[PDB]
PDB file of C-alpha atoms and ligand atoms in Angstrom:
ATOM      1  CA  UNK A  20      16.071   8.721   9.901  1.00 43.62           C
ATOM      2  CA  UNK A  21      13.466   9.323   6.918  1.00 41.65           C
ATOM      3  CA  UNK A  22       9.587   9.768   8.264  1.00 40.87           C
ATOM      4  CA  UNK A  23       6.599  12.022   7.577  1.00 42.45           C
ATOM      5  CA  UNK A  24       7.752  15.133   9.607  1.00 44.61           C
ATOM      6  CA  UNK A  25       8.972  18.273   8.575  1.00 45.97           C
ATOM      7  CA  UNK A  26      12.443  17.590   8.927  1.00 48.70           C
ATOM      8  CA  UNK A  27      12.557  14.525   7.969  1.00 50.33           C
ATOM      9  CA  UNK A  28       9.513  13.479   5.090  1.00 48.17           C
ATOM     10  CA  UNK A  29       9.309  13.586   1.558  1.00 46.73           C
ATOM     11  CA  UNK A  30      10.836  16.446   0.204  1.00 45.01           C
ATOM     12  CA  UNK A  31      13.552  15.411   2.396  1.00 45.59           C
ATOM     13  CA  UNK A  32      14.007  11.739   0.645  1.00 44.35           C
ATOM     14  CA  UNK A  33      16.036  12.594  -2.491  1.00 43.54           C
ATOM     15  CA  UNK A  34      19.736  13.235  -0.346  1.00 42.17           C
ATOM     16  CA  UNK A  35      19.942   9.884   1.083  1.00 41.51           C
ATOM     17  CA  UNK A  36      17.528   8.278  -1.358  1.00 38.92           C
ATOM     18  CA  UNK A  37      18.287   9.771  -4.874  1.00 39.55           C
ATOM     19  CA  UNK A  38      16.030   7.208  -6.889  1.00 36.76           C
ATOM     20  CA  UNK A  39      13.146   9.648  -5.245  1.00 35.79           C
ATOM     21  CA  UNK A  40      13.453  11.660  -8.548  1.00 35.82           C
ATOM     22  CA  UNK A  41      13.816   9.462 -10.963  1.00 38.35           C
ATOM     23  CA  UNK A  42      11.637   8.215 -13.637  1.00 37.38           C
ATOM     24  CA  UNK A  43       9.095   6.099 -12.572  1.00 40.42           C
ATOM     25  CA  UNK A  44       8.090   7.270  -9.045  1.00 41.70           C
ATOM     26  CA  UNK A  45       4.975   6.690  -6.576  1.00 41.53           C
ATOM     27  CA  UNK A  46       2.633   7.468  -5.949  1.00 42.09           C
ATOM     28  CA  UNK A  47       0.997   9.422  -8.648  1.00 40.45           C
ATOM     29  CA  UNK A  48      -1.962  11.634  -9.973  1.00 43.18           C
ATOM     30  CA  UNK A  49      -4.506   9.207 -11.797  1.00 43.34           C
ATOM     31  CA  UNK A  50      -5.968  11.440 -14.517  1.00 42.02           C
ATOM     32  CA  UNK A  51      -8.911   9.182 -15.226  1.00 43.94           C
ATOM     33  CA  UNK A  52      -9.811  11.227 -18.683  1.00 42.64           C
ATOM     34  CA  UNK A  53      -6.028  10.133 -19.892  1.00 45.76           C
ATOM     35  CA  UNK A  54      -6.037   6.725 -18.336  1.00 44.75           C
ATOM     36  CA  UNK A  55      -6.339   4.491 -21.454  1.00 41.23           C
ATOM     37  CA  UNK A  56      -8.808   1.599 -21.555  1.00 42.51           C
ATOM     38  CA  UNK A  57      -6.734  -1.649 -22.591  1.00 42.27           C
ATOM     39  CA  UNK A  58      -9.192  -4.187 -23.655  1.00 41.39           C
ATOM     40  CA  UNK A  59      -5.941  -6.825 -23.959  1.00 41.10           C
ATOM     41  CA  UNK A  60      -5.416  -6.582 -19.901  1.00 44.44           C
ATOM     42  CA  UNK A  61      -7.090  -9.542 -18.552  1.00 46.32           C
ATOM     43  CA  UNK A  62      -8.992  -9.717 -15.106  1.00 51.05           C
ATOM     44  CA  UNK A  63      -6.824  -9.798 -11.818  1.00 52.98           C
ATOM     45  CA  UNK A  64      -6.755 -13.363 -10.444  1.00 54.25           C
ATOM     46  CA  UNK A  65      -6.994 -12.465  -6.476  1.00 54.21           C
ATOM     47  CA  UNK A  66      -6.488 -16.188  -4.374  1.00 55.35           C
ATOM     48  CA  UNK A  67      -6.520 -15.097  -0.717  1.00 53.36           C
ATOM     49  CA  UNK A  68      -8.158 -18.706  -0.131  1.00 52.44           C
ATOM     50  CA  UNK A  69      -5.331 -20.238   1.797  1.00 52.87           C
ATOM     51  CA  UNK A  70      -3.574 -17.102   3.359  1.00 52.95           C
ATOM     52  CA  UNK A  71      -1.452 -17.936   6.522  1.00 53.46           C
ATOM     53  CA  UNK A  72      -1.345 -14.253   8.145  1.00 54.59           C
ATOM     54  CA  UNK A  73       1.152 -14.356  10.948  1.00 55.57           C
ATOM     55  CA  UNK A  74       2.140 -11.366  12.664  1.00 59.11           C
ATOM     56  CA  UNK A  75       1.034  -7.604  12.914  1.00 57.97           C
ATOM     57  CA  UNK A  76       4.393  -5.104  13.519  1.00 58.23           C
ATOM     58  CA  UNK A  77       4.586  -1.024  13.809  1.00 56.51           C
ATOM     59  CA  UNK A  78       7.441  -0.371  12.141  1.00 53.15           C
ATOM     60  CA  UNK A  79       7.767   3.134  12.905  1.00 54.16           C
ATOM     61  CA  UNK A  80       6.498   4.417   9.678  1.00 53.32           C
ATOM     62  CA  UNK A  81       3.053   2.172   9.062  1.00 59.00           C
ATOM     63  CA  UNK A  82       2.089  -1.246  10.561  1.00 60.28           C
ATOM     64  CA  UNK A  83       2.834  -4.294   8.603  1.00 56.45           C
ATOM     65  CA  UNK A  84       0.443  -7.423   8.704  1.00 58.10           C
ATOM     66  CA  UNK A  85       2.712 -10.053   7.405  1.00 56.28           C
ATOM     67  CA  UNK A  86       1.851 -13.109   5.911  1.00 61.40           C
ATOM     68  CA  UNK A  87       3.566 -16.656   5.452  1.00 57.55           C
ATOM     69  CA  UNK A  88       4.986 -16.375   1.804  1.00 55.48           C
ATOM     70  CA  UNK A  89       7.302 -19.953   1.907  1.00 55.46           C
ATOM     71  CA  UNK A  90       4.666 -20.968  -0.283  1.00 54.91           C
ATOM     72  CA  UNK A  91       1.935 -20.475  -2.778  1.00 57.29           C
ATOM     73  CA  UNK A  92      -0.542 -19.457  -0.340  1.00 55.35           C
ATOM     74  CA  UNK A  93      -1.813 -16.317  -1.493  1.00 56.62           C
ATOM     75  CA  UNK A  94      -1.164 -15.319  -4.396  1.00 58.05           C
ATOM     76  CA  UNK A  95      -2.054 -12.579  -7.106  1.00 59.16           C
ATOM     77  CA  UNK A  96      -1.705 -13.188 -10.893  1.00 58.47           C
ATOM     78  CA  UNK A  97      -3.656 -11.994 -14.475  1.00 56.75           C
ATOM     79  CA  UNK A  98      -4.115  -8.792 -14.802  1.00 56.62           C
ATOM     80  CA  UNK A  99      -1.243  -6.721 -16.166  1.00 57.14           C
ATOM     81  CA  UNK A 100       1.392  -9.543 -14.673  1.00 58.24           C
ATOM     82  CA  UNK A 101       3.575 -12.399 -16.382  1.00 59.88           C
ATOM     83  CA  UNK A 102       4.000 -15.018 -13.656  1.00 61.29           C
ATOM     84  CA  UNK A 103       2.546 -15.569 -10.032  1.00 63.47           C
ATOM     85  CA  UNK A 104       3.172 -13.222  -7.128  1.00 62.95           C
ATOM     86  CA  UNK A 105       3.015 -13.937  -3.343  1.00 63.92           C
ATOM     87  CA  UNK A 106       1.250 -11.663  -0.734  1.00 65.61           C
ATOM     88  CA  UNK A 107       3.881 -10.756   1.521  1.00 66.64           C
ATOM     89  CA  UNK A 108       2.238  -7.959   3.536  1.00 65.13           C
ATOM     90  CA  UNK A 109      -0.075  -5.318   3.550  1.00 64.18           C
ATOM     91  CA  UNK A 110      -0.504  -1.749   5.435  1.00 62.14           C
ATOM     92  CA  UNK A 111      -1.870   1.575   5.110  1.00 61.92           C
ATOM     93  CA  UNK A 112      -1.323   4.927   4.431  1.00 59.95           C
ATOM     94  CA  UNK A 113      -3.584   7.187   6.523  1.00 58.28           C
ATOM     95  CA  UNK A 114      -4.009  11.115   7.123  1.00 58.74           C
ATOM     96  CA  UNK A 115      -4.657  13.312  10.324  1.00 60.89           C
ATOM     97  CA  UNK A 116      -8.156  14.546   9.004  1.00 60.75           C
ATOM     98  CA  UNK A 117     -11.017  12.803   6.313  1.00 58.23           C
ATOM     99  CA  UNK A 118     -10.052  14.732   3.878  1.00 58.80           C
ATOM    100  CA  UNK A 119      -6.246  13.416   3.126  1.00 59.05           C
ATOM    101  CA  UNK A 120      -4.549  10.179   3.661  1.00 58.28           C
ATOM    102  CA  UNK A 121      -3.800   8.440   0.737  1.00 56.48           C
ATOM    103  CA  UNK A 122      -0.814   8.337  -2.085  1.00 52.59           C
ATOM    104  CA  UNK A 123      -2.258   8.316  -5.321  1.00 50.77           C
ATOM    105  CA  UNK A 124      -4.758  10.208  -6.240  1.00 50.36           C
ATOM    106  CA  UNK A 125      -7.658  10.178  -8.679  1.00 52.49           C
ATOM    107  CA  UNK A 126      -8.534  13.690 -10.794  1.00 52.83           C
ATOM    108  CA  UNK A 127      -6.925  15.111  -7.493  1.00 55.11           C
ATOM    109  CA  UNK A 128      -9.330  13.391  -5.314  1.00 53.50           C
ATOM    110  CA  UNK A 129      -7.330  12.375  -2.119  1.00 54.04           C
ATOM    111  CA  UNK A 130      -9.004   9.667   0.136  1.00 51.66           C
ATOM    112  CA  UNK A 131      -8.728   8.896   4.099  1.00 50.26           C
ATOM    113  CA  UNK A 132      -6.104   6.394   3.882  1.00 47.71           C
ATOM    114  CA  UNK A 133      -5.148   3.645   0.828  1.00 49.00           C
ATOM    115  CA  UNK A 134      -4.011   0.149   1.589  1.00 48.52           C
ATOM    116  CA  UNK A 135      -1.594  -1.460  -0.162  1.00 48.23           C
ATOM    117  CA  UNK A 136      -1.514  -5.495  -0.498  1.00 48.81           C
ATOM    118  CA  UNK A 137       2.690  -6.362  -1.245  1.00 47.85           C
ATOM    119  CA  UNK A 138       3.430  -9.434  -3.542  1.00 48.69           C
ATOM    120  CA  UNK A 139       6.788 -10.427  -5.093  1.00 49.51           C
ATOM    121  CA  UNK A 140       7.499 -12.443  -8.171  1.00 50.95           C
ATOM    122  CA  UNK A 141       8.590 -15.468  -7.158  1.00 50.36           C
ATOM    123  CA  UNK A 142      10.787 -15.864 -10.029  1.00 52.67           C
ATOM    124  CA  UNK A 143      13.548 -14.263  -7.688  1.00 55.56           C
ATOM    125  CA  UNK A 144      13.056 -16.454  -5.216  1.00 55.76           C
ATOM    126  CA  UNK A 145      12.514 -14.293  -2.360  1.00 53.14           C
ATOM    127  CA  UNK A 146      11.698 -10.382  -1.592  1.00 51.00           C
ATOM    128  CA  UNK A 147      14.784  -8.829  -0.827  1.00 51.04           C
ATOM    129  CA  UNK A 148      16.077 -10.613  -4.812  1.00 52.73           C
ATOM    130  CA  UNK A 149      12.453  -9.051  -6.062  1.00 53.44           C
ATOM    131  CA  UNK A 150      13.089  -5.796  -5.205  1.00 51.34           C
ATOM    132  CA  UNK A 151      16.203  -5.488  -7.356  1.00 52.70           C
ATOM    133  CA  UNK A 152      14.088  -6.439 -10.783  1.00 51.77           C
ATOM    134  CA  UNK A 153      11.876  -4.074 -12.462  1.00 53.62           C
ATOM    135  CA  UNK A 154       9.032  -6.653 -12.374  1.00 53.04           C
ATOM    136  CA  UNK A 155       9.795  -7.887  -8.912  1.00 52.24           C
ATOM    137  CA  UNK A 156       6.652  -6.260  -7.144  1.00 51.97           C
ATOM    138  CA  UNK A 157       3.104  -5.987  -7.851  1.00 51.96           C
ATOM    139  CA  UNK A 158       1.219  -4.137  -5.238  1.00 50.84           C
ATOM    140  CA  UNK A 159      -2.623  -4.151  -5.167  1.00 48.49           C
ATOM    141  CA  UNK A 160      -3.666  -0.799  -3.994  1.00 50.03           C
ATOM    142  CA  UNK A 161      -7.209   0.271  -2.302  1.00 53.65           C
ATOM    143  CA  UNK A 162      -8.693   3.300  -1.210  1.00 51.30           C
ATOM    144  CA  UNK A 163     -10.361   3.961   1.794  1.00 49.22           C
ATOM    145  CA  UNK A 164     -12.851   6.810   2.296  1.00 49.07           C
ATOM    146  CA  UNK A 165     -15.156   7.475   5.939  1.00 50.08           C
ATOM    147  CA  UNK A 166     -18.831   6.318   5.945  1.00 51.25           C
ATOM    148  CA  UNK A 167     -19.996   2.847   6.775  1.00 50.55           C
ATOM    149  CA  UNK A 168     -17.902   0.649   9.077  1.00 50.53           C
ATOM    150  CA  UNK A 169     -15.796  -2.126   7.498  1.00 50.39           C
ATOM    151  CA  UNK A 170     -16.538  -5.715   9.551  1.00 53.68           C
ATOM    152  CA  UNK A 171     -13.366  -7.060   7.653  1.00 54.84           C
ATOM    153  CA  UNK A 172     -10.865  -4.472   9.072  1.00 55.31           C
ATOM    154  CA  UNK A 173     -12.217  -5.019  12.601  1.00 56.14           C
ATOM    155  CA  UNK A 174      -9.919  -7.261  14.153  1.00 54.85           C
ATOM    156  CA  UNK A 175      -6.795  -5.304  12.633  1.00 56.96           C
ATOM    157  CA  UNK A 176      -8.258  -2.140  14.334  1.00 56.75           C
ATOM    158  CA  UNK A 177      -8.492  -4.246  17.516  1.00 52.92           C
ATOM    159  CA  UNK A 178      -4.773  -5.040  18.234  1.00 52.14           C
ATOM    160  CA  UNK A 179      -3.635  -1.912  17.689  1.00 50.21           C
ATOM    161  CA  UNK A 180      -3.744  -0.936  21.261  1.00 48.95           C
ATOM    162  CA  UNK A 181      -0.857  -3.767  21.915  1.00 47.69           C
ATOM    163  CA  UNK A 182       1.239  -2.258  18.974  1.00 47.47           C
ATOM    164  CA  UNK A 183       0.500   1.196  20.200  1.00 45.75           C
ATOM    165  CA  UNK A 184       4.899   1.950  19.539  1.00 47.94           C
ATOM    166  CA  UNK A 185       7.425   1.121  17.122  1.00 50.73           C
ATOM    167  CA  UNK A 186       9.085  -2.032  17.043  1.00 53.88           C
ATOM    168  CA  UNK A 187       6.063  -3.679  18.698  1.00 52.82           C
ATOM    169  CA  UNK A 188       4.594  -6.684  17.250  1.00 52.98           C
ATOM    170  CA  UNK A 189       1.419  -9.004  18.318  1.00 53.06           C
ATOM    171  CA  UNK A 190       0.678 -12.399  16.975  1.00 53.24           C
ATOM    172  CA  UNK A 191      -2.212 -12.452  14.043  1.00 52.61           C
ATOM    173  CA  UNK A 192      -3.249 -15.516  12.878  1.00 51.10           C
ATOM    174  CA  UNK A 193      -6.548 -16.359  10.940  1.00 48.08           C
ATOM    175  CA  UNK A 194      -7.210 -13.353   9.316  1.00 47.83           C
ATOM    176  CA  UNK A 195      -8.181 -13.171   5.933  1.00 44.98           C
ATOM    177  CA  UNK A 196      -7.385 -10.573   3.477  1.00 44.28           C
ATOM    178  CA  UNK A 197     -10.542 -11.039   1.034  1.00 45.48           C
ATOM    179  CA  UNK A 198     -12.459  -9.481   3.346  1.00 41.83           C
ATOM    180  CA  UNK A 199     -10.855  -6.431   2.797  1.00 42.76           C
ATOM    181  CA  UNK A 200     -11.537  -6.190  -1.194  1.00 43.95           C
ATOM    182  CA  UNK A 201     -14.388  -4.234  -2.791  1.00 44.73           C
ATOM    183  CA  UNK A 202     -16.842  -5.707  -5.305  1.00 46.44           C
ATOM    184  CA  UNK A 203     -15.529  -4.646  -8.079  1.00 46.33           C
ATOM    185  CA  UNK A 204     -11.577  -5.888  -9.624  1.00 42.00           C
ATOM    186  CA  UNK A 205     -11.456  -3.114 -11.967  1.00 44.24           C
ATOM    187  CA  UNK A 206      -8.093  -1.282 -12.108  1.00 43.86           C
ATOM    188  CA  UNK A 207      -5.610   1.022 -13.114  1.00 48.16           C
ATOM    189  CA  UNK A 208      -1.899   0.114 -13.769  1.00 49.21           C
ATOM    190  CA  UNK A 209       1.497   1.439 -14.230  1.00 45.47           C
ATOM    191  CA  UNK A 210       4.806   0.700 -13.119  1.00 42.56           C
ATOM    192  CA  UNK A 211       6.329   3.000 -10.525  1.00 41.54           C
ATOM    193  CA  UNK A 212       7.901   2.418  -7.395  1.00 44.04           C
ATOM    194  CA  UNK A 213       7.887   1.311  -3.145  1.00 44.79           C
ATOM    195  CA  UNK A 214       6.420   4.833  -1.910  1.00 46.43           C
ATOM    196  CA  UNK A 215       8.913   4.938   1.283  1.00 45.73           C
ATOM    197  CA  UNK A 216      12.528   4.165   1.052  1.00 41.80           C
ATOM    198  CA  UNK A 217      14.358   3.023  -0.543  1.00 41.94           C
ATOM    199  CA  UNK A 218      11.975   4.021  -3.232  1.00 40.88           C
ATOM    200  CA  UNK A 219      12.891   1.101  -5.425  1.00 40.83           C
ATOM    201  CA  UNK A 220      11.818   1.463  -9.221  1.00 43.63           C
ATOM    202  CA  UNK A 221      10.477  -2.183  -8.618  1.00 43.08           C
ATOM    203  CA  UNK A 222       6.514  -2.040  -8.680  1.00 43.38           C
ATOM    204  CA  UNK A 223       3.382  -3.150 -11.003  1.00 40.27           C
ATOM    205  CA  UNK A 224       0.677  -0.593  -9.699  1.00 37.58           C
ATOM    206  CA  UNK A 225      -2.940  -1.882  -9.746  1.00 34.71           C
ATOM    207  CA  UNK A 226      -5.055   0.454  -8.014  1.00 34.95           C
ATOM    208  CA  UNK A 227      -8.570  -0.851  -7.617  1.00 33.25           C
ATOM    209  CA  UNK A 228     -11.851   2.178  -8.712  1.00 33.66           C
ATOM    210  CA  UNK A 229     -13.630   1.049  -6.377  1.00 36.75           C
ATOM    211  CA  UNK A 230     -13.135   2.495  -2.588  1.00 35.26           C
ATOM    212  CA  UNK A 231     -14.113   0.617   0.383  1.00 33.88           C
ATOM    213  CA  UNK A 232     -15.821   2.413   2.934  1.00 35.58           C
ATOM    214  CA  UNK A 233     -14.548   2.119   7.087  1.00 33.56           C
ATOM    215  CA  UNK A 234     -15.638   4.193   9.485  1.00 31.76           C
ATOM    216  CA  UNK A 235     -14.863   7.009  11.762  1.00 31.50           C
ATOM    217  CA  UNK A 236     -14.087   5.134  14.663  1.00 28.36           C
ATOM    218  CA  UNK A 237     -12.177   2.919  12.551  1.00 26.69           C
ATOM    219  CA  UNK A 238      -9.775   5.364  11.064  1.00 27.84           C
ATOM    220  CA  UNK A 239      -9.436   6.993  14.756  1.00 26.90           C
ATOM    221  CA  UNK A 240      -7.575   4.072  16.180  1.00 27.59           C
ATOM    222  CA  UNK A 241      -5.096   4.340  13.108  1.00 27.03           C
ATOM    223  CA  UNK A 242      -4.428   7.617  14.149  1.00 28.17           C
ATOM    224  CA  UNK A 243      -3.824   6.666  17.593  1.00 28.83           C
ATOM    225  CA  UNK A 244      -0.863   4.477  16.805  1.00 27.92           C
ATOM    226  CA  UNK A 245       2.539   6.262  17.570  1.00 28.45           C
ATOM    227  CA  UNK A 246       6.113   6.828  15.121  1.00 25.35           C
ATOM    228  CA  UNK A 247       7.730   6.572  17.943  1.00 27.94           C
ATOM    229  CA  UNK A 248       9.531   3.628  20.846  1.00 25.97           C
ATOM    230  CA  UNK A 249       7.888   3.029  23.957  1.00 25.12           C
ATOM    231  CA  UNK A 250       9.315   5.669  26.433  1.00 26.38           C
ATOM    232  CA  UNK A 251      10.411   8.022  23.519  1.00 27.54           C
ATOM    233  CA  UNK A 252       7.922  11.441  22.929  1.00 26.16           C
ATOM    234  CA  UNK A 253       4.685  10.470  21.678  1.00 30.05           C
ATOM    235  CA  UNK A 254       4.183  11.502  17.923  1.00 32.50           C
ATOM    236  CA  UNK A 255       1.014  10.439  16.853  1.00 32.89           C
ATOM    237  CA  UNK A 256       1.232   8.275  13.318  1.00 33.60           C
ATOM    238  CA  UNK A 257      -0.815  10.468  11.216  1.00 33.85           C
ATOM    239  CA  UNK A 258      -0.106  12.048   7.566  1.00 32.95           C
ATOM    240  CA  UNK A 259       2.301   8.865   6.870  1.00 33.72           C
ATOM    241  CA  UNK A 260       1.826   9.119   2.617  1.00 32.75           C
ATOM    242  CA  UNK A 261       4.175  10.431  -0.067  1.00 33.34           C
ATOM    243  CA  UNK A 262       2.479  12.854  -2.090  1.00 34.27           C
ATOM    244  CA  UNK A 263       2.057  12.605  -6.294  1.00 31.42           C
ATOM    245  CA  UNK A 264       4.870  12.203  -8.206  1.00 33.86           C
ATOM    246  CA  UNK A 265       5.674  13.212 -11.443  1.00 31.09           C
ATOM    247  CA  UNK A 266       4.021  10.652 -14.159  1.00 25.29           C
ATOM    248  CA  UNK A 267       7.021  11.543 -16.445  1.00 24.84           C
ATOM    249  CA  UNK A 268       7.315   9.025 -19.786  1.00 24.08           C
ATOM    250  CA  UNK A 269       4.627   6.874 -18.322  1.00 26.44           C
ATOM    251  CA  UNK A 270       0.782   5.826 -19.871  1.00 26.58           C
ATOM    252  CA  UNK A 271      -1.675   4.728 -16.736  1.00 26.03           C
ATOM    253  CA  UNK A 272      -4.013   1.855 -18.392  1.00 26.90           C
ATOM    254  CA  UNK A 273      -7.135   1.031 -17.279  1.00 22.21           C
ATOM    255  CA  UNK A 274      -9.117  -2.411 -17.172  1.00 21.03           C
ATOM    256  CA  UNK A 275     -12.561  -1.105 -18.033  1.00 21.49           C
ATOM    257  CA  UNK A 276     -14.597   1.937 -20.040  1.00 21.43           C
TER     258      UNK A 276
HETATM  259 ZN1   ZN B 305       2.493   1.535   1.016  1.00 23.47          ZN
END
């Protein structure tokens, strides 16, 4: 019974989730003036081309859009990664006002919401193996801040009315990912952790510079969308994001001056 709530969110975590304070945590603080350029890391190889999406879900915390990953469909690779990783899912982290909404943060800064794009090495064969292995994850991670509408995130804000409750899920076919990336591939990485439980110490970070922008009506049906069942007390899913974590023995590297 983890959530966002006061009883319940992340300063709660740590008793049935110890890993919350351990060593390489997320999200965290990215001090831009310590981030160190690494002209070795190579450009992220993004191919969204043949993405199957499949299904949109509330799970009660977020909602997932899910994705087929039997195959190499779409897949990310380059940057700071060794090997080939498949888009599983994505989802967002979103806040109850402009001003906060997503996990990490940059020089403080803390944007409406951040999306994170889930892949797993598939070296282990499937997720559930992936999330065991320090290397197992690499999550692609995007801020969002208000201004100009985003035509790409249009159809996800449209079927949110039929997922309105937890444990709902709506069929969602044909929709493609790209159209949710900024220009620019530049990056910072480190390796940290899943940012809900069970917190696992699993993840390559790569969180783009660039923002993309959606707009006010946009982020308003997010915060429509409800923690709770159908028929249960209507909690409004707002504020779901961990706050900064400690960076601890860990160097944040950045693809560009
Ligand atoms: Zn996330």
């Amino acid at each position: 019974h983890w959530g966002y709530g006061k009883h319940n969110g992340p300063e709660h975590w740590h008793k049935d989730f110890p890993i919350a304070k351990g060593e390489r945590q997320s999200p965290v603080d990215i001090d831009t003036h310590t981030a160190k350029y690494d002209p070795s890391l190579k450009p992220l190889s993004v191919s969204y081309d043949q993405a199957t999406s499949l299904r949109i879900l509330n799970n009660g915390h977020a909602f997932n859009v899910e994705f087929d990953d039997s195959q190499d469909k779409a897949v990310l690779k380059g940057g700071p990664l060794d090997g080939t990783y498949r888009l599983i899912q994505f989802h967002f982290h979103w806040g109850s006002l402009d001003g906060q909404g997503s996990e990490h943060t940059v020089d403080k800064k803390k944007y409406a919401a951040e999306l994170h794009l889930v892949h797993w090495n598939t070296k282990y064969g499937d997720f559930g193996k992936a999330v065991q292995q320090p290397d197992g994850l690499a999550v692609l991670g995007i801020f969002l801040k208000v201004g100009s509408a985003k035509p790409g995130l249009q159809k996800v804000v449209d079927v949110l009315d039929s997922i309105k409750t937890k444990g709902k899920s709506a069929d969602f076919t044909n929709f493609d990912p790209r159209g949710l990336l900024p220009e620019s591939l530049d990056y910072w990485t480190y390796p940290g952790s899943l940012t809900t439980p069970p917190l696992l110490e699993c993840v390559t970070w790569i969180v783009l510079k660039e923002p993309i922008s959606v707009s006010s009506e946009q982020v308003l049906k997010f915060r429509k969308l409800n923690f709770n069942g159908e028929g249960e007390p209507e909690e409004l899913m707002v504020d779901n994001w961990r706050p900064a974590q400690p960076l601890k023995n860990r160097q944040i590297k950045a693809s560009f001056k």
